Structure 1
């Protein structure tokens, strides 16, 4: 009966806010049937085991010739609860709605896939600042440690610890910059989110290859010296594609700032020396692969900060662009999202 009840409560969902509906439906079924078992069937152990087995067969209900949607749905539910948004929930509300969530989580029986998905979402919510409360992230990491073993929340807790200990690293880096021989010029405001390889799901895979711009090579050098002197025996590999930097467009009117990724930032360097820059004239400095350069150029053309001097808007060998001096943005904080 419980099994069929699950198939009348969770299988009828049609897209929309499925993460907040699947978990809520399973929790409603569980709450109805554990109340019924406790007050009618004397809370018998066999019936509670039957409830747990039926919900186990209900939660990860695998459609034939398909993967079960339960791990991704539960990961997205946790993501939506923890991510800061205009839903107006408080810390108490999200703490309650995650403690009740664990009841659904124990029936997944495919915990590795949920671990991968939760790591993928936690990486984004910790890097891009989408987390609502860091204490909420700690509470959710600790709850999964109480549900299943520590080896489950090893990488997750290490990611949380890495993102927590970043202000202290930045403070120590600034202290080193001040007390490192002469006063090194701080032409940039360099805050670093150092991460542990193997913990974070991020893979560098530098087959694309990249060259750091000249005005950022000094910061790379001084941070390399800081992280080789203060800490020892640690290969600091650079994860380039997640590095973002802001630029104010004083070249034309000085109307706004232009927060943009480093890969798209390296486009602007060659355009700084000369307004008209070709595809290879841009590529000789960045020294990156054609795919990432084409993607960044297409994204900037959507931004339309650079206007294509060549009539053929599609990317080709020549692909000469210039600074669109007529281009302007409505806001004074024109952030470029990816």
Structure 2
């Protein structure tokens, strides 16, 4: 009553407000989440959210002063999580959103889930950390697209419509074209089949139909690792007749190769097993590596490896656990001590079904992908430090300039001596600094 009505009364109020707001944020979201899981993380989030909002629904009763402290310390705790890379904080929720948009998470309802997500982005509007989160969770949802844990296509779609309304802008449009792209990827496989049907090539193909747009942008999906392969003849026909339709359509990106669309094709091949035990991508590739040779050492596979290992450790592990391999080691690829037979046994429900178990693991992968982020955040930090220097003093030379640049950031890291050229080049474009007549080096500052 008074200290609001007393206008200078309020300032103590809003001060103590924002103090408690930030402190309670840290406490009941950062300090109360202790498994650090987006389950508990996001739930501590929602705890603080409801606490502050409801608390203001009370005697607070508005007083945008009070709302001022509310929103201020709210977004403070928003971007002031303990791990200073707070962009993974939404990415935490992204992981949670991974849960939140993975079909196998739970059976739920339109806006049963989506409204929880709603309040999530309700606060995400307080988030500046998107772009990395953009990349991250676009990647995760693109996977789950691949991997089926896309809890709803159109639901997620309208969700990100609403997002771009208040979130990232054109990554949205990216993934829109992605959606339509893979949809009619199926459909154009179907057309190839519509005109691939005309028996002129193409007898008893039908091996796969995984399909996108030939890397050379920045997407959340890669042809996972792979190398030379036999790719039987129908796979030839697929890439080539698609390229018929598609070089008709588009050229420059084309039928590239991408393993992680691969899955297992081990079925009524000729098996005493009545069994169809599909496997993951390099499960497929490395089981392909062990088909006819009824046993194979580390050296026999090592002949035509030209790849990495973990593919085959997943291979032998899933093959022994189900008992589909008469192996010798479940190791990364195999012991030279160890080898490979197709065992007949199976351990799960159906006619050897649910062996499709990629381990589906990253900790070592989590770090590998964290590496990409260092390069883009260092580059941004540098663009600003570079333009600011370039405005201050016009060096500006090429060679001496780059050396001086080196001098200014001795502490940071070791740069490329070359690319010195490119460096000035980068500033030449922005209208930040120009190229003088005097030398290939030694240019001038503009603007």
TM over 0.5: yes
Question: Does 2:150 correspond to 1:131?
Answer: yes
- Whether the aligned pair in 1 keeps the contact of 2:79 and 2:127 (CA below 8 Å) is yes
Deviations 1:194-242 (Å, cap 9, x if unpaired)?
6765342334586866553456444344334343334444333211133
Higher relative contact order (CA 8 A, sep 6+): 1
SS of match in other structure, 2:354: coil
Which deviates more from structure 2 when the two are superposed, residues 16-25 or residues 128-137?
Answer: 16-25
Summarize deviations over 1:218-270 as a string: whole Å, max 9, x none: 43443343433344443332111331133215543232211113433344446
Q: Is the 8 A contact 1:9 1:26 kept in 2?
A: yes
Gaps of 5+ in 2: 1-19, 358-447
Does the aligned pair in 2 maintain the 1:156–1:199 contact within 8 Å?
Answer: no
Q: 1:196 to 1:168 in 2, by over 3 A?
A: farther
Q: Distance in 1 between matches of 2:231 and 2:157?
A: 35
Q: TM-score, normalised by structure 1?
A: 0.80
Specify whether residues 221 and 300 from structure 1 end up closer, same or farther in structure 2 by C-alpha distance, changes over 3 A only. Answer: farther
1:298-327: CA deviation from partner (whole Å, max 9, x where unpaired): 554555423236999983447432232466
TM-score normalised per structure 2: 0.63
Q: 1:306 aligns with which of 313, 325, 344?
A: 325
Structure 2: how far apart are the matches of 1:33 and 1:278? 63
With 93-102 and 291-300 compared, the bigger mean Cα shift is at 291-300
1:4: how far off?
2.0
- Whether contact under 8 Å (1:209, 1:289) holds in the other structure is no
Per-residue deviation, 1:113: 2.7
1:253-306 deviation digits (Å, cap 9, x = unpaired): 232211113433344446443423344434545654556556645554555423
Q: Is the 8 A contact 1:249 1:256 kept in 2?
A: yes
Question: What secondary structure sits across from 2:261 in the alignment?
Answer: strand
Q: Which has the higher strand share?
A: 1
Say what the alpha-carbon RMSD is for the aligned residues: 3.8
C-alpha separation between the residues in 2 aligned to 1:130 and 1:263? Answer: 20
Q: Flag the 1:68–1:27 CA change in 2: closer, same or farther, 3 A.
A: same
Is the CA contact 2:21–2:70 (under 8 Å) kept in the aligned structure 1? yes
Moved more, 188-197 or 77-86: 188-197
Greater shift after overlay, 274-283 or 239-248?
274-283
Deviations 1:107-141 (A, max 9, x none): 23322232122112111211111112211110221
Contact 1:141 1:157 in 2 (8 A): no
* C-alpha separation in 2, matches of 1:129 and 1:44: 47
**Greater Cα shift, 264-273 or 117-126:** 264-273
Taking a change above 3 Å as real, the CA distance of residues 161 and 105 of structure 1, as seen in their structure-2 partners, is: farther
Aligned residue pair count: 338
Q: Is the contact between residue 307 and residue 324 of structure 1 (CA under 8 Å) also seen in structure 2?
A: yes
Query: Retained in 2: the 8 A contact 1:307–1:321?
Result: yes
Q: Distance in 2 between matches of 1:143 and 1:290?
A: 42
Comparing 188-197 with 255-264, greater Cα deviation is found at: 188-197
Aligned 8 A contact 2:310 2:332 in 1: no
Q: Is the 8 A contact 1:244 1:259 kept in 2?
A: yes
Give the structure with higher Rg (CA): 2
Q: CA offsets, 1:68-89, max 9 Å, x none?
A: 7522322122222221136331
CA change 1:7–1:259 in 2 (3 A) is same
Range with greater deviation from structure 2 (112-121 or 242-251): 242-251
User: Is the CA contact (8 Å cut-off) linking 2:38 and 2:93 kept in structure 1?
Assistant: yes
User: Aligned partners of 1:23, 1:195: CA distance in 2, in Å?
Assistant: 36
Instruction: Give the corresponding residue for 2:300.
Output: 281
Mapped partners of 1:56, 1:64: distance in 2: 15
Where do 1:56-67 residues align within 5 Å? 56-63=75-82
Structure 1 residues 199 and 165: CA distance shift in structure 2, 3 A: farther
Hey, what does 1:115 align to over in structure 2?
134
Q: C-alpha offsets along residues 166-209 of structure 1, whole Å, 9 cap, x if unaligned?
A: 33233223213124745543353545466765342334586866
Matched, 1:98 2:111: no
Q: Which segment drifts farther, 290-299 or 8-17? A: 290-299
Q: Single out whichever of 202-211 and 157-166 deviates more from structure 2.
A: 202-211
